[PDB]
Each structure stands twice: as structure tokens, then as C-alpha cells.
Ligand binder design. Sequence first.
Ligand SMILES: [K+]
Ligand SMILES: [K+]
Ligand SMILES: [K+]
Ligand SMILES: [Mg+2]
Ligand SMILES: [Mg+2]
Ligand SMILES: [Mg+2]
Ligand SMILES: [Mg+2]
Ligand SMILES: [Mg+2]
Ligand SMILES: [Mg+2]
Ligand SMILES: [Mg+2]
Ligand SMILES: [Mg+2]
Ligand SMILES: [Mg+2]
Ligand SMILES: [Mg+2]
Ligand SMILES: [Mg+2]
Ligand SMILES: [Mg+2]
Ligand SMILES: [Mg+2]
Ligand SMILES: [Mg+2]
Ligand SMILES: [Mg+2]
Ligand SMILES: [Mg+2]
Ligand SMILES: [Mg+2]
Ligand SMILES: [Mg+2]
Ligand SMILES: [Mg+2]
Ligand SMILES: [Mg+2]
Ligand SMILES: [Mg+2]
Ligand SMILES: [Mg+2]
Ligand SMILES: [Mg+2]
Ligand SMILES: [Mg+2]
Ligand SMILES: [Mg+2]
Ligand SMILES: [Mg+2]
Ligand SMILES: [Mg+2]
Ligand SMILES: [Mg+2]
Ligand SMILES: [Mg+2]
Ligand SMILES: [Mg+2]
Ligand SMILES: [Mg+2]
Ligand SMILES: [Mg+2]
Ligand SMILES: [Mg+2]
Ligand SMILES: [Mg+2]
Ligand SMILES: [Mg+2]
Ligand SMILES: [Mg+2]
Ligand SMILES: [Mg+2]
Ligand SMILES: [Mg+2]
Ligand SMILES: [Mg+2]
Ligand code: NA
Ligand code: NA
Ligand code: NA
Ligand code: NA
Ligand code: NA
Ligand code: NA
Ligand code: NA
Ligand code: NA
Ligand code: NA
Ligand code: NA
Ligand code: NA
Ligand code: NA
Ligand code: NA
Ligand code: NA
Ligand code: NA
Lengths: 144, 169
Amino acid sequence: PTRFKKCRHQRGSTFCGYGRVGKHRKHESGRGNAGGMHHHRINFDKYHPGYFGKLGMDHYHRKKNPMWKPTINLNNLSRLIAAEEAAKAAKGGTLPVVDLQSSGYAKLLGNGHIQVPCIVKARYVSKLADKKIRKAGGAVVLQA
Amino acid sequence: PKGNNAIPHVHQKKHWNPCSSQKGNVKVFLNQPAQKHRRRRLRLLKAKKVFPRPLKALRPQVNCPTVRHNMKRRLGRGFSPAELKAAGLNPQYAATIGIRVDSRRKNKSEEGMNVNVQRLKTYMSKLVLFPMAVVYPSAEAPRAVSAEEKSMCVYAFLKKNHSAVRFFG
RNA sequence: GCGCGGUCCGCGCACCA
RNA sequence: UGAUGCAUCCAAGUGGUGUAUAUCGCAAACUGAUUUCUGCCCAGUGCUCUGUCAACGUGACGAGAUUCACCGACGCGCGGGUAAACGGCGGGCUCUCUUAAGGUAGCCAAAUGCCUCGUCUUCCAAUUAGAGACGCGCAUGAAUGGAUUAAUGAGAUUCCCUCUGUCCCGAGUUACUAUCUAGCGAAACGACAGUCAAGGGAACGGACUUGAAGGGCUAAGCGGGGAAAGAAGACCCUGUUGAGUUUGACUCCAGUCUGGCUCUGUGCGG
RNA sequence: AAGCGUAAAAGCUUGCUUGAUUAACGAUUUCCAGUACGAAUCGAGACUGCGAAAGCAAGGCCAGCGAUCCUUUGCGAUGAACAAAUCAUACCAGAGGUGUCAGAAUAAUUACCACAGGGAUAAGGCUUGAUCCUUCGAUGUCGGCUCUUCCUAACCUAGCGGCUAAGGGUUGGAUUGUUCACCCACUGACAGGGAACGUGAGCUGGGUUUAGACCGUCGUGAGACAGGUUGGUUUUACCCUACUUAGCUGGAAAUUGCG
RNA sequence: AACGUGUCGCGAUGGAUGACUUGGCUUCCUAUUUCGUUGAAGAACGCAGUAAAGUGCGAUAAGUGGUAUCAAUUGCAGACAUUC
RNA sequence: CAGUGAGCGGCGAGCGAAGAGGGAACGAACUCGUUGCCGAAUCGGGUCUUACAAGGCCUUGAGUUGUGGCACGUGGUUGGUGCAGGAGUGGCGAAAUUCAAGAAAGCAAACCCGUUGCUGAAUACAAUCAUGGAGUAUUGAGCCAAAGAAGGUGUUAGCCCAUUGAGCCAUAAACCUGAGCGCCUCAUGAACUAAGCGAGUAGCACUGUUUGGGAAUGCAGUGUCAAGUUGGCAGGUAUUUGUCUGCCAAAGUUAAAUACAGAGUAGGAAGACCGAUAGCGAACAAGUAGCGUGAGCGAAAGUUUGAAAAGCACUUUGGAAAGAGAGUGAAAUAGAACCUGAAGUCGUGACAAAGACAAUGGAAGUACCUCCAUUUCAAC
RNA sequence: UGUUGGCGAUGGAAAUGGGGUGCCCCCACCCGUCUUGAAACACGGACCAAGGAGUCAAACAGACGCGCAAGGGAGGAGAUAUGCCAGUACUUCUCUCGUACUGAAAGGGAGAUGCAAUGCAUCUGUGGUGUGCACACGUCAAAUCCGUUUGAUUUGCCCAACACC
RNA sequence: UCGAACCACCUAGUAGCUGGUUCACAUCGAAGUUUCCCUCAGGAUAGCUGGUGCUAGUAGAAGUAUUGUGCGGUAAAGCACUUUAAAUGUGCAAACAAACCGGCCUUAGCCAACUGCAAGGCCGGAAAGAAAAGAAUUAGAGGCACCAAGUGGGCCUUCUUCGGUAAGCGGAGCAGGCGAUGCGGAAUGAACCGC
RNA sequence: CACCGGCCCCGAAAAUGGAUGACGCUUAAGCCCAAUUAGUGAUUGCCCAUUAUUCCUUUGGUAAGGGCGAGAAAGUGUAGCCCUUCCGAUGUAGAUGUGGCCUGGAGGUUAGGACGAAGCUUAUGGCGUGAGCCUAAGAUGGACCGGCCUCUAGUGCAGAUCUUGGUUGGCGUAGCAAAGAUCUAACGGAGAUAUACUCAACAUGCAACGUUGGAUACUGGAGCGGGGAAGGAUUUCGUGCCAACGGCACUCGUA
Ligand SMILES: [K+]
Ligand SMILES: [K+]
Ligand SMILES: [K+]
Ligand SMILES: [Mg+2]
Ligand SMILES: [Mg+2]
Ligand SMILES: [Mg+2]
Ligand SMILES: [Mg+2]
Ligand SMILES: [Mg+2]
Ligand SMILES: [Mg+2]
Ligand SMILES: [Mg+2]
Ligand SMILES: [Mg+2]
Ligand SMILES: [Mg+2]
Ligand SMILES: [Mg+2]
Ligand SMILES: [Mg+2]
Ligand SMILES: [Mg+2]
Ligand SMILES: [Mg+2]
Ligand SMILES: [Mg+2]
Ligand SMILES: [Mg+2]
Ligand SMILES: [Mg+2]
Ligand SMILES: [Mg+2]
Ligand SMILES: [Mg+2]
Ligand SMILES: [Mg+2]
Ligand SMILES: [Mg+2]
Ligand SMILES: [Mg+2]
Ligand SMILES: [Mg+2]
Ligand SMILES: [Mg+2]
Ligand SMILES: [Mg+2]
Ligand SMILES: [Mg+2]
Ligand SMILES: [Mg+2]
Ligand SMILES: [Mg+2]
Ligand SMILES: [Mg+2]
Ligand SMILES: [Mg+2]
Ligand SMILES: [Mg+2]
Ligand SMILES: [Mg+2]
Ligand SMILES: [Mg+2]
Ligand SMILES: [Mg+2]
Ligand SMILES: [Mg+2]
Ligand SMILES: [Mg+2]
Ligand SMILES: [Mg+2]
Ligand SMILES: [Mg+2]
Ligand SMILES: [Mg+2]
Ligand SMILES: [Mg+2]
Ligand code: NA
Ligand code: NA
Ligand code: NA
Ligand code: NA
Ligand code: NA
Ligand code: NA
Ligand code: NA
Ligand code: NA
Ligand code: NA
Ligand code: NA
Ligand code: NA
Ligand code: NA
Ligand code: NA
Ligand code: NA
Ligand code: NA
């Protein structure tokens, strides 16, 4: 809305908040990111360390679909089980089955304490996750 | 006095804006509801004209290609000649009785071929000739942990299989 | 930096920190 | 420069100009009638004649991409010529060295001499002027032409005779204006205004401080002030602003020359 | 270079040596934004040197040096359908350099000249040439002619015994654009100064200062010369005030009160 | 005195404001939708009882024919309705 | 996907895509050359069938230096004759007050009482005398609505007019009626009758350009110039050597979904837009009048009097323009470009003073005026 | 907080405030600008009307308002109310930002306690210490209408947050 | 119209330079300085200022004294630069996350050893909570963040001064002013006197 | 006798007439000290600030208390819910706040108008610190429009050598001066011989125009003569007319 802007508060004041000594002029420092090495060096070096240079190897035709690999944690595993099966679950008997690749995940990581034993089907798994789930009472089955 | 802002990359340094000297390069969407209405009206008219034939022809079911979409299914372009032969149909006759045909597809495994043959047979059963969704595999039911599953870990198997290819040759 | 001649001196040639 | 030419236009072609020509011709430069002369220098830079390297080609290493070596034209380098080519003509009897040579015949305080109103003679009562002589000439000089010259010049300078209101030193007259009337009728300019002395002040006030004048309204003049009008100072400086021109500035492009391949065939020899 | 420091030494001689090495991204000082670079201080680990030993030493105390990208050397993953050998690339540590040294790859001339600005800056006041306060959307520049006024530190004239006195005077000619200077002649005498270095809508235009052209010296050149020479548009008052003359008419509570 | 100054009532010169709007600008949609040697687009000259411009038309020239409609057109003139 | 943990870039300023996924569209697919088998069965021209037939008859004209064909009961798309419907287009086609009152104005405190009560009889007015538009308004009753929709009409209209529903009439050819329906002619679908796949091409070298394309993404010029299914091309880092995967260049046609960034024809619908110095340059005889040798440049300007011309007959002064009367009209203070009619400037009448301190300005009083407001009047 | 006079008897009145013009005493440099400094001999400045200058889009951030929350939200498109209606009502799938980072890369990938030294066992739970709202338990002052307040402090747990591990 | 004609267009070319920039009250209120820049008529950066807050309101306070304890080589003094050495200055401390006095636990940290020293904790005690000797005072709430403007030409005076003959001249140190500000006085004056 | 201080004089010379601020002052109205009504006896001679003290009013707080015959709302901000109390108040560049003011349009709500809307005028007052709002009168106008809550934007002018249109002083002014020059009578024409009267007439209708006759001059054969090209395109001719144009005038005209 134009009625809330600062220019409506400034009608009658000649300079509009820019001063009589240093006026409001077109481009007093250059256009764009000009001068990042000469006269804007302090700004660049103190707020954006690492802007200039090269690092690492190249990869000419990157495709992200072969690189798809999302992750989920043991203490988060309960989002993928329905409430009734979670209540019915108990170590030593019949456990719920979780399909990570159908739920949208690829790798199982092992942070935290597992809140319910279950059988997990995953493409990948880590050492700690495998060990912890085996101790809890569930199991992990590799899929493709 | 530029403080702590991002470094901008707004990319607007060609003559896209129409002014007294420039024609511009812009595209607005102010005809969106009108065009949507027109499309719907055309579809209703076409269905009325081609009645009693269905408006959209029969299509197969295929798997999505990459490793990110491996687990999903959608509609394909047309049925392959192997599937048509296994259903006992001529391609040129199927094209007239309302089935889409695609002679480029390959049929590299038996499961997809079975699914499409079943689709064709259902359609042929339900079709009447005047004289002149996709299916996902079923979820697994709850079970119990076995002795081997309790005893051994799968991480070592995964890692050894990865190392075989990584350091093979 | 390079070919020559008699460490140097003469030629004729090359130049993205 | 003898036409297969020299100079040269055009994006191009069986294209164009000097050339409807043909060395008593055509093209490109310099000096500037006649008369008299035109001195010395080829070191520099030009212009001209007589080892090094590009493409290509050949051989060797290698599985191969490669790599190495040899060959390879002008040009450059070396050596001659050339000053009516650009230009130069000093320094310490000599001798030298600079870098090649050291200002010849002439001319001059000149439209070229700083010092300088040079020194001498002449011209006037008196001449920083003029003329004639003299030359250690800041810094004259030979087709970057030197010296001289009758006739000619809306060229630049000095003197003499004649003549005169240029002057001593101004006076009188005429026509048209200005001046007044009838008719007709603008512009420029325009913060507001408009009497002085001293003081202080962005250091030269109409307006402020303290004094001193000043009744209002008018006609013809005048050029002291209004730091009067005219035009975003053309001098000087600034800007990471221009343009014209030059070159032995950086980076390039036509034009000219040179080599290879291609156009490209047939026989006899070495 | 200079300062500080040092006597069985930090100086001199001498014997053995290479702590001038490596040092897990340890912390800190100086500059400072509490950023880097250069330099320096306190340390931990390895392998060592000298010494009987405690100890001392990771150069010569304190000035002597350098980013990204690129090239190159040493050390120890990739080339995406798969495999081998070359080749290229990557992570880490150095070297090749930016002296305008927190780091573009850079010659002149314009008098034929241009634009945006600047009294932030050159060509009346202060000090005594200096300075840079006003003026760059402009305050017309030397000399002469013409005309008025003022000063005194008195040239003549006038009084005194060197003093008083600014009242009235202070000339015309040759050469030169001159101011100044010099010379001839008259005179009682041929004094010195201020007024925006008085005075250009008062004049003149000889000088200086544009474009044309010649010379000397300078430059390879285009061109330059507080060197010489010749030729080169001088605009407007009819407004207000000042001044000079020329007319009409109110007014003493200086227009009113009868004050 | 006159000229000048100031305030109020009335009047001139001038053409703002408000109200109005057969115009512009912008956005959408539909289709038996795309000129010319069978002479186009453009350009010129003419045509009415009265007719300069504009509009329409072309020596059949402010229009001829056919359909539909139904009594005008109008500045002034002039002259089949069961539709001439 | 993606302003991208791709990539290009004095690796600076900056630039910059593709595969996959959800969708729109979709009856979407076909034709030559080559190989094999036929070999004029083909084309043009005359002529006859209603016929410049995809038909018959005839023709050396073209063509064997190869036109054409074939393969791994139905036809309205052969032609000639007839006659139907639908859509589209154009005409026709609907209700209800010119109702009553000439103060034609009010009050009775959410609703009801109220279909009822009570409020003046007016003449005011105008710096003695005369003078002073049109009812879509007000108030009360009453109707129509499958129509309240916006325009016209002398002021604000559902009822005064127009418009709109159902529903009728007419309609060369084209479009739809799976094939619209017949007849003649002609075609034709179902039952009997061995090798092969596009040469100055792809590639390679040099040079130039273009790309995000990086030991080279696409293209162009010259030099050079292949292979044969065993083969060739592509798999985003160059070379040589083995595998694997996808596809078969160097010939052709093809609807829909998409653009219309200063087009056009016929026909429509709109807007939190502008409101005559705005919006197109142009609301008007506007690309006009005018300017320039020319290429070109290019305005100003609402006729907005009034409801209706009723647009001032007649008297009279003047050469006339005009003035003074009279008249039309609700208004002439609406008199011809004539609605309203501002500021600035000027004339005139009355008044106030005083211009020897430029004016303007501030603070505080007073003299005179005041078409202004408020208060009081016999109790404060 | 009363008392005594004047004017005012319904007018062309009286009074009190506004407004207008003149006069007297006092005060008072011309506006806008740039500048250390303007009344300036520093620039712009005859009068009036109408017009006339921080806006639209796109990327990011901080503060404030609103919805949902380990999840939030599309977009494009479709379906039928729907055939006035460019609006409103409804929607599968997907996509995107986030819940996990790190390495040049091949790649790897985060709980506590006890006992031991890809180990074993339990799982109602802040990894520890210092400084730390409110609440709970005690104690002491001041004031008090005696009912309680206003303060201080001790101990327990300490929420948010900061410092050291 | 010529040291590169005219017409239309790219083009509203770019400008660190000049000019302009439209209503009122209220609460607050500057800087001409630092570092880097082909930087010097301009930027970025810190300081000065505004807005928004967070947190356990007197807390980890101070442009000022007192007491205790350190640093210094200027004025003056002296001499054939230097011992001697001020006045004005400047660092630290002055009882509640501190420190004190005796258990215990842990560590190799040091030492020939430890119950010695070092370091981190637990437990218990004392406490004019800081007396008396001139023996502080406060218009005395401590700490922590986020977002952003203008400014980056200064000038005058008191004392101290370097250059310059001097100067209404150039360059610095400390503080106060003007700029940004009137009012009352010095007859008048940016800066003097009072406020 | 020498020196050594207080006041005064000499040393001490400029350009428009002039400056203790001016007049003036000398038993000071000058200079250096010292008093406050004078040896009489307690305490302050008097004049002038935007300062100090105190009183009234406004406005804002890092605000502090109380309440919930006309009156009271559990409350940031108003015509403030009501009452009491204390402290501050200037400011360029700059920041922020405001139940702060104003303009064109949209969604709602409440209203006005032919018994007179918008617009316009003002010695029309009232209210507000202010931006502004409201009433009155029109001897103005003739058809539309106000308040409140939200939404929206081409939203506020004194100056830019600002843009377009109108006006204005200068001002009845500067000027309308080359090319020699006209006079007279009679006709024509509204262009006159134009009077309140007295009055013979002048002193009270001026100035200027066309045609014809006469007079006087000029051009002077390289002519203000008679024909043509380029350029122009009806300016040619007759009859009328005289608004505008022919920079004065017209009865006349290339109008
Ligand atoms: K030579
Ligand atoms: K002078
Ligand atoms: K030379
Ligand atoms: Mg690299
Ligand atoms: Mg900054
Ligand atoms: Mg800053
Ligand atoms: Mg244009
Ligand atoms: Mg002479
Ligand atoms: Mg010679
Ligand atoms: Mg001659
Ligand atoms: Mg200038
Ligand atoms: Mg020793
Ligand atoms: Mg060193
Ligand atoms: Mg050293
Ligand atoms: Mg000087
Ligand atoms: Mg001269
Ligand atoms: Mg040179
Ligand atoms: Mg009198
Ligand atoms: Mg009088
Ligand atoms: Mg064939
Ligand atoms: Mg080829
Ligand atoms: Mg490119
Ligand atoms: Mg092929
Ligand atoms: Mg217009
Ligand atoms: Mg009118
Ligand atoms: Mg994260
Ligand atoms: Mg010319
Ligand atoms: Mg303040
Ligand atoms: Mg001393
Ligand atoms: Mg300033
Ligand atoms: Mg204030
Ligand atoms: Mg301000
Ligand atoms: Mg608008
Ligand atoms: Mg008035
Ligand atoms: Mg605007
Ligand atoms: Mg005159
Ligand atoms: Mg005259
Ligand atoms: Mg004249
Ligand atoms: Mg004659
Ligand atoms: Mg003659
Ligand atoms: Mg005339
Ligand atoms: Mg005639
Ligand atoms: Na600035
Ligand atoms: Na001589
Ligand atoms: Na005069
Ligand atoms: Na470190
Ligand atoms: Na200056
Ligand atoms: Na590009
Ligand atoms: Na009736
Ligand atoms: Na300005
Ligand atoms: Na000023
Ligand atoms: Na400036
Ligand atoms: Na600044
Ligand atoms: Na500045
Ligand atoms: Na005095
Ligand atoms: Na205006
Ligand atoms: Na004459």
C-alpha cells in the first residue's frame, strides 16, 4: 500500500532523508558487485570469506536421480508405523514391518534410543543402527 | 552502506521490459481461467460427438526409470506386440477397436508382460462391438524375527559386496 | 627461454603469473 | 616506367581511371622569372643493389595420442651506392676526439643579434626612428636554395616640396533629426526598492549601529553609481569526460612481397 | 644507519659441529577494523649438536619483503556402462610477482578546439614578495586625451631666523605604444602623490592576447618559444538615483484639535 | 490642491473549477476468417435541383438490380401503398 | 528440475541448460529409393456414355537412359442424376398506474396500537404600490414478476417507450445425421482358382564463428576422404586394447495441444483505468491546417444557448456598426459560439487617512465602524 | 463568602467577545541555496491558473500481525455446483523447503547410565559444574484497620539464558 | 548547418558533477575522525545517532576523592649531553561466582620420598559483612544482543608548541565553543562577558 | 645636590566631511581608591534578562498513588474512564510515533437534495497548539452528494535559466527621417458651413478622401517605358463594397 510508505511522511521536507551535503546521486560506488577486490574489500572479506578462488574436481554431467539417498533415524522410526500396530507391537512376538523405499527413504541411521522394535526394509544401513536394532529385538532386511 | 546481506544474482540485464524503445520479452497468465473453461467445453463436446466410445483410449502400465522412481508405476504409451500376441490380437485390429499400440517397447521381464496381458483380457471381456488404475504390490503383513536374523548382521554383507566391485579388477 | 658462433660477448628468434 | 608496364579505383566479375595514350609520353616530388652561383659530410635514419626461420616435406622412438632430429623462401644480419633524400657543418700552429665532416663563396644588429637605445658617419635646434659603414654572427649561409635585380604592387617603413580647421582655438551658416502637435504604436529589462558620512561585517552597504539631510508632483538632458544588460568564463584547474592531428605508445586490419599445395596433362634424357 | 645492551662477556683466539632441520591447523604481541601480510615472544612432539655437568641452540635480537587465477616441483582419490596401460585432473607443502609494494597489461600534441563543473584552485584585504578571504550561470586589461576634487614630507610665490605656510601656480617639442628615461628651448618654477594602480553604455586602439603568414632556436613528427615581424568587428540607456537647467502646488499638532 | 496609497459595493478583461461524455487505453472470447495479371494496395480527376470540405459513388457516378420493411426525406425546393 | 555443492568466465563483472516426475493434446501415423517377382498393365490428347468420370473406344504423342503393380457383401472420398432432416444465419414474437390529492407538508421515540389520532388554512419574501417551466418529487392506495437489465423520455420511472422469454417463418453451395436416403455407372474386401536397407556422404587436419559444452556443443570454407551387419553411430576427459547397452544418418508428407511483443475481416463481452493541458498525435471536415529542395516534421480546436428557435416583430436616433424602448422565455444576470464563470489586472461610487524614517511585519493600547456571535432585561 | 451602587423596562437597547481601518510608544536587515562563514558587491527570483519528482517487478535478510507444526505449502492441471461466475466451493499423484552433517573425492554418518576395556546389561529420561524466574519448605525485620502485606534471606527443584568442561 | 552535412532510429545513451524534490504536531538527536581503495569533488569500514528489545531491578557502576603499592626523565638544576629532579599525570587493590581456618576424595603433576608442594572437588567453622585513627560521595538498576540513517571540506579561542621575516599564514597536543542558537550586555561584530 | 615614580605637554606627517556612539562635561559627567544615607549605635542605595524562587495552564514520561443535584467505561492511543501527585520541555543533517489533517476511486453502513446538489464569493463567525473542520449570507448556481469502519492509488507545491495558457509595468514612451514636391477650382460623398441662446461674420465641427480641368516639378532610352524565360497561378476585366488587411488615411485597392 502506498499510504504506508515513508515518502508520504516526507512531503514538505526537501531532501527526503538523504542530506544537503552528500546528495542522492545515481551510482556513487559502481554497479552491482563491482569492486569486491579494491574498494569493497573489507565488506567482502569480513562478511563473505571464501568468495574468490577454485577448489576440487569437476563433474561434467551431474544427474541427481542416481544420487538420491534420504535418511531417517531410529528414534524417528515411529512416524512410519500406524498407531494400532504400534500399540500391538511387543518384543518377542509378531512385529510390524516398515518399507523405507515406499515411504520415501533409502538409508537408516542410528541416532538415539529406539522407541519400538520392528522389522525394517532398507537399501542401506549403518553399523550402529544395525547393532542397536538387533539388540532392541527387531531386525533389518536389505532391499533393492 | 551495504551491511551483511547476501550477494545478489538477480539476472535481469537484458531488454526484457517493454518501454518506448523495446518490444520486451514477457509472458503473463491473464487468460488462464478463460482457457481452462474453453478446454473443458471442448472435452464435453468431443465426448458427446464420439459417444458411445470412451473418450480416452486404453493404455498399459509401466515402471518409472531411474533409481529414484523405481518403485512407482504410471501409464505408458501403448501395448507392445508381444503382449498383443499373448492376448491373441492383431495390432492393426486393436488400433481400430480402441487400443493404443507401441512397437518400440521391449518387455524385458515376465511380470510386466503378465500385468499388461491381464489388462487386455479384461478390456476384451468388457467390450461390446456394434455391427457395421495402476496396481501396486501388496504390503507385507506382520511377522516374527528368525534365528538367523537375530544372529547375524547385514552390514558386513553389504560392505563386502560393495568392496568386491569397488576393488575388483 | 631457443638455435648459432667467438664464463662472457655478439647475432637471428619466444613472450598469459 | 617499354604495356606481362608504372601510378591507381572497387565488396565482387570477362569490372574501372591517367589511356581516343606510347619516352618531345604518362605518373610522383621539391625549388620558384632573368643574371650569377650552388661548397664539405654516406658515420645515424631512409631508399636502393648483392648464420637465423613459418607452413610444407623426410627420418627415427612409441601400443597410440606424441616426441626428437633434418630440411625449409623472402626478410634480417654482413658488404657496396646515394645529400637539387631527411638532414649536419663543434670542442679542446697543430695534433687529436665527437659522430661523418667541421661553415666555402657570399650577406648582416636584417621581417633572423640576447646583451641592446651596440660603435662610427649622416639626416634635425633636439632623433630608442631612417640610411651608409663595421662584425668573436645568443642562434646568417648556399634548390631546407645564397647574393643581386629593371618593370609591376588597395604590401611594410623614413625624409622632402605643395597643401591644408589635424592643431594653436575655435566662430558662423544649410538640410534631416531631436524638440511640440494629429494619427499609429513596440522591445530589452523587471526579488523588493532606490539621499549621504563614519563603523563593523564573506575584508568596497539601499536595507544593520551612531550621526547628517530629505514637502509633494513634473518637462528636457546627461553618463558618476546601481560591483547596470547581453552569454551555465572561450583564460587556469578538476573529472578514472570528449574529439581533431602525430609517432621510433599498446593491440590489431587492408595493401605489397615470399614459400607450399592445387589448378596439372604427354614423350625424350641426366 | 642509529639507539639500547654487554668484562672470568654478548668482545678476541681456539676445538668440535649444522637447532639456519622437523615441528600434530597450540596460544600470543606489534599494525589494527582488534582483518590480513611482514617481523617478533611463550610453548608441546621427533631427531640431533656442544658440554664433566647444570644448561644452551629450532640462524646472524630489534629494517632486509608479496594475494586470487595460471605455470612448475615434492609428497601421499577421480575421469559416471565395465576393465587394463598411458595421459589429464584433484587434496597437502614449497618456488616463478606484482617496488603505484592490500597487487590494471599503457606514448604525445591542440593557437582549429569541446562538454560537465569549480572562487575546494591560478592570472580589493592581511602580512610582508608571501598568503588564498570575496568574485569562474564573467566586476571589460596598458598608455594617452578630456575633466573635477583631495593630501604634504614646500619646486616657485609669501613671512621670519634652518622655521612657519597647502592659498595661487607648476610649460612646448625631437625619438619611443609606452609609464620611466634622455636631449633641445622658455620660465619665477618647470615638486611629489591619492581618488577600484580616478576616469572604455566618455573616446582612441599604438602595445598586449585567437584564427592567416615569414624567420631564428627547439622537436623524428604533429607542434612549442614571459624571442622577433606583418595583418587582424570596441554592442545597448527610453528605468531608479546623482548632477544641470525648466514649471505647478500644499503646508506650523509640518495636511488632524476647537491644542 | 493634484498625483499616489488603503478598505468596501457595482462593472469590465480573462477563461480556471464543477457537473456532463456517441472518445481513448487495457483485458478477454467466437469463426465456413486472410489481397493481386479475372489488374491489387496506393495515387489522380470527376458525379446532387441547390453542394467549398467531409462522406458515398464512377459518364448507369450522394447511385442501377434483388430481398425484406412499410410511409417518409427535410435547410429550401420538388414528387406503389393490397407496396412500382 | 534450477539462478543450480552441473558447468562457462581478465574463474572478475557476470552468464547458464538437460534427463527423470505431475500434466495439456492424442482414433497418429504414413510415402519413395534400394532387394525380389512382373514389365507400359502408366501418362497426355481426341471422342462417347447427362460426365474436360479414377469408365469404354481410339491415338507415337511422352515414356524402356523405366511409368506403374505386388510382397518379405461393401464403398455418398469414382462419376452422373434426384430429395430429406439438423445445426448455423436472417426476420417475427410477452405482464403490470400517466392511479388520487394543485398541508402535493409533519408529528405520534425498536415492533404493535396506526386500516387511527391532532398540527396551519399563510402567505411570507424582497437592501403606498405592483410582481413572481417541466412531476421520473412528496403523500396515500394498487398492481406485474420464469421479466427489478444497465437505455430513452423537459427533475431521481419495475407500471410512459424500447429491450428480454417460450414459440413461429425463410433459408444457392459447404458442415452433422456412425453409412442421411434411392437409381445408373465404376471400384473392391471375404469364400472356389531368394537377396537386400540412401558417397565427395560420415569422418580427419587447419582456419573462422557459435554454445553451459570444458584435449573442441553445432555450423562454414579448403585439403584429404571410408566401412559394409562380420558393419556403422551414441554412451559429456584425450590415446591404444577388450567387453556391454541403445539405435540404424546422409530422401519425403503429417492434425491437436503453443505464439500473435506497434497486422487484418465479420461479430461480441468487460474494467477498483483517463475524464478535454488527462486518455491515442487526433472526443471536432486529424496524419488534417501548416513547415522543409528533400528524407521527413506536425498542431490548436467539447457549436456545453434553451425543454422548445419561441433566435428579439414594431417605435425612435444614427451613413452604418450600434444605442434607448417594446417583446419571447422559468430565467437574456441564457442574445449565437451564448452552462457555471475563479485568480491576476483594470474602471467607477463611497469612505479612511496622510507620501519628509520604501513598503510589508511583532507586541500592546486607543479612536471610529461592524449585513458577526453570545448574554441580560427586575432578578440577579 | 456574602454586601452596596451604576447600566439594562424588549429596543434602531445595553454589555461582553470576535472582525475591519487609521494613529501613538517600543521592537524588527531579503527569501531559497551551496558554504567554516550570506543582509551581502555570491547564484535563482514581474504576476496568476492548471500541471510537476522515491514508483512497479524480481532475489535475500531483520522486526511486527495471522494459520499450522516434525512438519508446512504449492504450482500447473482436473472434476462438478456450472451450463451470475476472470469469482467462490472440491481434489489423487507429485514437487519443494525442513526434521543431519561432513569430506577434493572414493565414502562415512551423531542417546544415557552401570560393569568391562561392530564388548555386555538395563531404559519414567535433564552428560557434569558455576551463576540463575516462578513454586514449595523454614527464619527474621518494617508497617498494620490485626486480617495480612512489603521486604529480605536458608534449603529443594531449578524453566529461559550465559561461562567452563 | 562543416577540424567530419542533414533526416529518422538504437536513445528516456552514461554522468563519483550542477539544479529541483509538495501536510501538521510530538519524543529523541550528530559528524568533519580511524583503516583499506588508479584513493584525494567518491566509496567500503569502525566511532558518534535512532528504533526494537532480552534478562533474576539496584547486580560485574563511575571523565571525582582517600589510603596502600608500582611506572616516568619534561620544566627547573648542572656541564670539561647528564647523574639530580618537580607540578600536572598514569597502572593495580580495597570481603557475598572472591578470600580465610581445619578433615576427606582424586590425579601423576613436582620432589629420593611425603601427606611436603601443585591442581580440581566434598565436608565443617568464623564473619566490627568491614571497627577506631579527618577514614568517601552519588538526580548511584548491572549485563547482552538485533536492524538502520546521516557524516567522512570544518572553523575559532585558552594554554603547549614545530615551519615561516611576518601574516585575518601552514602543521600538531589538551580542553571549551561556533557549525546546529536564540536571549541579556560590550554603540556595531559567527566565536568575547552573563545565561 | 643626584635619582625616581603619578598626571599632563613635546617627540607624533596623508589623501570625500566625521566621529570616547552623539551632544556635551572641568567645585567632572575624567583618572586611582572607598562607601550606602553617614563618627548616630546590628540588618539589602536602585535599574534592566527567554536565568533563580514562586503561582496558573499545556504536553510527554523508565512515571508514582487512589476509585470504579451533576456525575464514573477494568481503561496504549479520543471530546483523553474519574481524581490527586512529581519531574522534563530549544535544536541543523537524521530516525521514529500519532482513535493526527487532507485528495480521486472500491466493499459495507448511516443519511441529505427542485421548500435547491456540486462549484464559486467573504470586515460570516464558532471550534482546534496546528494541518484543518463546521455554521451564516449570496440581491450566486441549477443536479447531484455528506459522515463513520475497512480497502486501494497517476494522493498535498513558492521557487527546477521548470512546462502550457493568460496578464502586466516600462508606455501613449522609443520611434514611424534614403529614393527632392506639390498647389488650386469645380464636381462626388454621411464624411458639414454640425451651437444652449445673444449675436453678421473671426475669437465654439477640426482633420483627412476620389474624379476632371489648370499650374509646378520628377524619371531622363543602362527609364517608377514596351515585350519574354525561371518562379508564381486568376493577381487579369466589369459592377459593387469598405467589417478585417494595405504598420498614417481612404469614397480607393494585387483586399
Ligand atoms: K646511409
Ligand atoms: K585603472
Ligand atoms: K630540424
Ligand atoms: Mg588447480
Ligand atoms: Mg560505509
Ligand atoms: Mg557505517
Ligand atoms: Mg521512439
Ligand atoms: Mg621623424
Ligand atoms: Mg648543397
Ligand atoms: Mg595584382
Ligand atoms: Mg561555469
Ligand atoms: Mg665463556
Ligand atoms: Mg630479521
Ligand atoms: Mg640483525
Ligand atoms: Mg605569490
Ligand atoms: Mg592593434
Ligand atoms: Mg623527441
Ligand atoms: Mg493645521
Ligand atoms: Mg486635500
Ligand atoms: Mg518404381
Ligand atoms: Mg565431406
Ligand atoms: Mg559467444
Ligand atoms: Mg540407412
Ligand atoms: Mg488531447
Ligand atoms: Mg456565460
Ligand atoms: Mg540444518
Ligand atoms: Mg553554408
Ligand atoms: Mg534534547
Ligand atoms: Mg632546561
Ligand atoms: Mg554544513
Ligand atoms: Mg524538540
Ligand atoms: Mg529536519
Ligand atoms: Mg485517479
Ligand atoms: Mg478582504
Ligand atoms: Mg504525481
Ligand atoms: Mg515621440
Ligand atoms: Mg517622423
Ligand atoms: Mg530612423
Ligand atoms: Mg530632370
Ligand atoms: Mg549613365
Ligand atoms: Mg492602416
Ligand atoms: Mg474596382
Ligand atoms: Na553519499
Ligand atoms: Na643598417
Ligand atoms: Na528624467
Ligand atoms: Na592457529
Ligand atoms: Na578562495
Ligand atoms: Na549469452
Ligand atoms: Na393524475
Ligand atoms: Na540543492
Ligand atoms: Na541567505
Ligand atoms: Na560541491
Ligand atoms: Na559525508
Ligand atoms: Na563532501
Ligand atoms: Na558610551
Ligand atoms: Na499552482
Ligand atoms: Na523623403
